[PDB]
Amino acid sequence: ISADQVNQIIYNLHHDPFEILGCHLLEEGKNTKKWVVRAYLPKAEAAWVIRPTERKEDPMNSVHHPNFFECIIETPELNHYQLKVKEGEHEKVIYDPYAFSSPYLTDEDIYLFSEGNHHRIYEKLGAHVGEINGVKGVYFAVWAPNARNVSVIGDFNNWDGREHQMRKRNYTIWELFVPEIGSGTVYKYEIKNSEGHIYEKSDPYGFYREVRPNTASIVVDIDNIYQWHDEEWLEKRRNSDPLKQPVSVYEVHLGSWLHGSSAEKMPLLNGEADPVIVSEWNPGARFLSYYELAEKLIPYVKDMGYTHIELLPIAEHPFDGSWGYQVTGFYSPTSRFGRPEDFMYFVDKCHENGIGVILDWVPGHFPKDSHGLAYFDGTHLYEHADPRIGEHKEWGTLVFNYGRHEVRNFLVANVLFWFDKYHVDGIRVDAVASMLYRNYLRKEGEWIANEYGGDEHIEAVSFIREVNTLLFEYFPGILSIAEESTEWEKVSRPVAAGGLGFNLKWDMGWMHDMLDYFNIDPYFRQYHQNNVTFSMLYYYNENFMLALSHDEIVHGKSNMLGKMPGDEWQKYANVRALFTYMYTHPGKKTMFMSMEFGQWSEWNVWGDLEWHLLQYEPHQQLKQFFTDLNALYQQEPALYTHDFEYHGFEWIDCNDNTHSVVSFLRRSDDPNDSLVVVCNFTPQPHSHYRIGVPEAGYYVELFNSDAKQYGGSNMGNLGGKWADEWSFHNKPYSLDLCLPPLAVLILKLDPTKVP
């Protein structure tokens, strides 16, 4: 490019910047092509073009002006790129604003979609505000290849679309522009299928929806509704390895954490809506908005010291009682709590406060509701046609046809959409086995094996691998967490190594072993020391997340206090010891709302939590306990830098099963950061209990779960204890400790203390 052209841009004289900025084809070679990407980035010193799916980065060069950049690249296709932009001492990574000239679908969009590789298809399918033939309006587009006809109905043409029939392209997608409408437009697709039947559909790619039980999509100007402030959090994230950091997750269901009064409007970010009543049986109550949650949940979590909040699914879902796990608007956060910009604000505020957001994501299935994806075009479009792989009969839901391109695409782009539009920091997938197995909850003769006569759902495995490969390339630094409950190997290993490519995996064995263990009367725990120690046998085959989740405190399993034997005192003690052990045991942490203040009742998704218990001392004390524990966790490198290396852990001794005592070391990079942890899992204190340590000196008591400030009896070692040169458990030195009742101690050597 020339200097006159550059200057036209800099001084805003150019007639159409899309001719020059963006990605443009320079020439076609035999095997590859030459492209140029250009960007005008005022205030940027430097820039790069990222080709995330090829795993490449190329620098851009200033040309004629220091903020006008060009990059020339040779590669056959150049569909997927990002700009990395450096403004002084900060870097951001963004999609190229000048990537798409036109709001309508191109031949390139359609081709890519048909191959299943349009990672940004949501920019073109759905509904977008736009200009065509010189007129402001909305462009609508929708995949329905076997439909006979499709129209658009809504407020603007009183729900009759005779004059708004849509043009069908490449025998696959239906499109239409409508002038003079804008965001807020309420609408659906009127589809007539191959048999004359004329059903209505919510927009599969729609970005906002009416409040359940209504289901009309609403048009959002999604790139012009909210102003972010999280550049620095995003940079820190992209350049960090979250597996070597502390990660204590507070799991939350937004609809049932706290309610407000339905006798008032729900405040939003600079606005307000009509309240959404939580149910007809509790009509005095409403949900809080994303906005109100940003104001109440976030500082509450900040205070507790958790690093992350994980949300049960917020994609639009018709029925509260599904907990979110039956989704019908995969491209919108639920209107129960307000608008897309309100959730943006929620995520932005988390980031301002140093807190990550993880979303439960549900690509495994979708319900039969007729507003949604089922039998979409009058065929089995999204679901597999054959119910032996296309239906989950015990759930009454449909399974996505992962081998169908436009379906894979819908899902692969969907996961990316949450990281792109809403800046989230991780996803989790419930019930991964349900995707992995052709025989999932099906008995002999109602399932067909794969090609090679195995149980493996081959299209599913391959969708999962692609999803995770892509996520980490596009947004390095995120968490992709799985719960897979069948011993399937290499879940949290990279696709390269024959993994499924998640980076963390819930340890469900550890959860069963610990809750089974703590549920036994202390006296009999001697018969079950292996519950305590077994998880470390297979521990290194995966990167484990220690999760004690919402699933474990419903449907008659009790909340955590109620799982524990003994009187009130011993019940809180057992909670303290279990969670102290959890936070010291290798792996990342997840725990569910209500557990941190000792709720008695099971989680009830129709009400809110029992906040009034925080008026009382024991509940307050338990909450302080968790507050200090999270504070410690963040503060002590040995508790997070080496969760997943052998160096990070070693048992000191685990043979005293008679007193249900175990002890171990955690280590980090610096050996002065090493910690000694000792657990006493009965209410029998011990008085001169000897534990091998590996160096001499004063070991400070960093933490003692029996402290009276936490509800304990206050037995302890009075701040710490000098080692003895008295060999024990194969170690040169040893400590002669008080073990408080039902309690855990964390000690560290202070190698500069006065002998």
Ligand X SMILES: OC[C@H]1O[C@H](O[C@H]2[C@H](O)[C@@H](O)[C@@H](O[C@H]3[C@H](O)[C@@H](O)[C@@H](O[C@H]4[C@H](O)[C@@H](O)[C@@H](O)O[C@@H]4CO)O[C@@H]3CO)O[C@@H]2CO)[C@H](O)[C@@H](O)[C@@H]1O
Ligand Y SMILES: OC[C@H]1O[C@H](O[C@H]2[C@H](O)[C@@H](O)[C@@H](O)O[C@@H]2CO)[C@H](O)[C@@H](O)[C@@H]1O
Ligand Z SMILES: OC[C@H]1O[C@H](O[C@H]2[C@H](O)[C@@H](O)[C@@H](O[C@H]3[C@H](O)[C@@H](O)[C@@H](O)O[C@@H]3CO)O[C@@H]2CO)[C@H](O)[C@@H](O)[C@@H]1O
State the DSSP H helix or E strand holding residue 108, giving kind and residue range, or none if neither: helix 107-115
Of 660, 692, 665, the residue nearest 677 (C-alpha): 665
Size of the site for ligand Y (CB under 6 A): 5
Catalytic status, residue 483: yes
Answer yes or no whether residue 688 interacts with ligand X by CB under 6 A: yes
Q: For residue 130, what are the contacts with CB-CB under 8 A and spacing of at least 6? A: 103, 104, 136, 137, 138, 139, 177
Q: Nearer Cβ to ligand Z, position 186 or 508?
A: 186
Please name every residue paired with 27 in a beta bridge, in sequence order, or none if there are none: 34
Q: Is 69 in contact with 36 (CB distance < 8 Å)?
A: no
Answer yes or no whether residue 715 interacts with ligand X by CB under 6 A: yes
CB atoms within 10 A of CB 348: 20
Answer yes or no whether residue 724 interacts with ligand X by CB under 6 A: no
Answer yes or no whether residue 342 interacts with Mg ion by CB under 5 A: no
Residue 256, token pair as written in the block: 């049932």
Q: For residue 640, what are the contacts with CB-CB under 8 A and spacing of at least 6? A: 244, 245, 246, 247, 588, 633, 634
- Min CB(188)–ligand Z separation in Å: 6
Answer yes or no whether residue 403 interacts with ligand Y by CB under 6 A: yes
Q: Is 315 in contact with 329 (CB distance < 8 Å)?
A: yes
Residue 479, token pair as written in the block: 């968490």
The residue within the footprint of ligand X, chosen from 689, 695, 700, 724 (CB under 6 A), is 689
Answer yes or no whether residue 352 interacts with ligand Z by CB under 6 A: no
Q: Nearer Cβ to ligand Z, position 106 or 214?
A: 214
C-alpha distances out from residue 123 to 17, 26, 32, 203, Å: 20, 25, 27, 14
The residue within the footprint of ligand Y, chosen from 17, 22, 130, 145 (CB under 6 A), is 145
**Which of the stretches 14-22, 402-410, 447-455, 473-481 binds ligand Y when contact is defined by CB under 6 A?**
402-410
Residue 274, token pair as written in the block: 């009509």
What residue 224 binds from ligand Y, ligand Z, Mg ion, none (CB within 5 to 8 A, per partner kind)?
A: none
Annotate each residue in 626-655 with x if it binds ligand X (CB under 6 A) or - if it does not, as one string.
---------------------------x-x
Of 649, 685, 654, 643, the residue nearest 666 (C-alpha): 649
What residue 404 binds from ligand Y, ligand X, ligand Z, none (CB within 5 to 8 A, per partner kind)?
A: ligand Y
- Min CB(577)–ligand Z separation in Å: 52
Q: Is the peptide bond before 59 cis (omega within 30 degrees of 0)?
A: no
**608 is an annotated ligand-binding site residue:** yes
Answer yes or no whether residue 404 interacts with ligand Y by CB under 6 A: yes
Answer yes or no whether residue 457 interacts with ligand Y by CB under 6 A: no
Query: To which residue do tokens 């008995």 refer?
Result: 443
Residue 699 three-state SS: strand
Query: To which residue do tokens 């391109």 refer?
Result: 405
Please name every residue paired with 721 in a beta bridge, in sequence order, or none if there are none: 699
What residue 608 binds from ligand Y, ligand X, Mg ion, none (CB within 5 to 8 A, per partner kind)?
A: Mg ion
Of 620, 628, 623, 652, the residue nearest 703 (C-alpha): 628
Annotate each residue in 572-611 with x if it binds Mg ion (CB under 5 A) or - if it does not, as one string.
------------------------------------x---
Q: Nearer Cβ to ligand Y, position 145 or 271?
A: 145
**Which of the stretches 179-187, 403-411, 445-453, 471-479 binds ligand Y when contact is defined by CB under 6 A?**
403-411
- Min CB(190)–ligand Z separation in Å: 8
Three-state SS across 77-93?
Answer: CCCCCEEEEEECCEEEE
Q: Strands 504-506 and 479-482: what pairing?
A: parallel
Rounded to whole angstroms, the Cα distance separating 643 from 639 reads 7
Rounded to whole angstroms, the Cα distance separating 34 from 32 reads 7
The residue within the footprint of ligand Y, chosen from 360, 406, 420, 551 (CB under 6 A), is 406
Q: Nearer Cβ to ligand Z, position 216 or 578?
A: 216
Residue 531, token pair as written in the block: 């519950």
Strands (E), 304-448: 308-311, 315-316, 329-333, 356-361, 366-367, 391-392, 397-398, 426-429
Please name every residue paired with 209 in a beta bridge, in sequence order, or none if there are none: 217
Subset of residues 566 to 595 that bind ligand X, contact rule: CB under 6 A = 567, 569-570
**Which of the stretches 83-91, 208-216, 270-278, 397-405 binds ligand Z when contact is defined by CB under 6 A?**
208-216
Answer yes or no whether residue 360 interacts with ligand Y by CB under 6 A: no
Please name every residue paired with 480 in a beta bridge, in sequence order, or none if there are none: 427
Answer yes or no whether residue 214 interacts with ligand Z by CB under 6 A: yes
Catalytic status, residue 430: yes
What residue 348 binds from ligand Z, ligand Y, Mg ion, none (CB within 5 to 8 A, per partner kind)?
A: none
- Min CB(581)–Mg ion separation in Å: 24
- Min CB(632)–ligand X separation in Å: 23
What residue 159 binds from ligand Z, ligand X, Mg ion, none (CB within 5 to 8 A, per partner kind)?
A: ligand Z
Residue 23, token pair as written in the block: 């990605």
- How buried is 307 (Cβ within 10 angstroms: 0-12 exposed, 13-18 middle, 19+ buried)? buried
The residue within the footprint of ligand Z, chosen from 87, 96, 200, 473 (CB under 6 A), is 200
Tell me which of 109, 123, 383, 483 is the catalytic residue.
483
The residue within the footprint of Mg ion, chosen from 309, 381, 431, 678 (CB under 5 A), is 431
Please name every residue paired with 73 in a beta bridge, in sequence order, or none if there are none: 35
Residue 180, token pair as written in the block: 């003079």
Answer yes or no whether residue 395 interacts with ligand X by CB under 6 A: no
Answer yes or no whether residue 522 interacts with ligand X by CB under 6 A: no
Answer yes or no whether residue 685 interacts with ligand X by CB under 6 A: yes
Residue nearest to ligand Y (CB): 405
> Which residues form the interface with ligand X (CB under 6 A)?
567, 569-570, 653, 655-656, 658, 683, 685, 688-690, 713, 715, 741
Catalytic residue IDs = 430, 483
> Which residues form the interface with ligand Z (CB under 6 A)?
159, 188, 200, 210, 214, 216
Binding residues for Mg(2+): 608
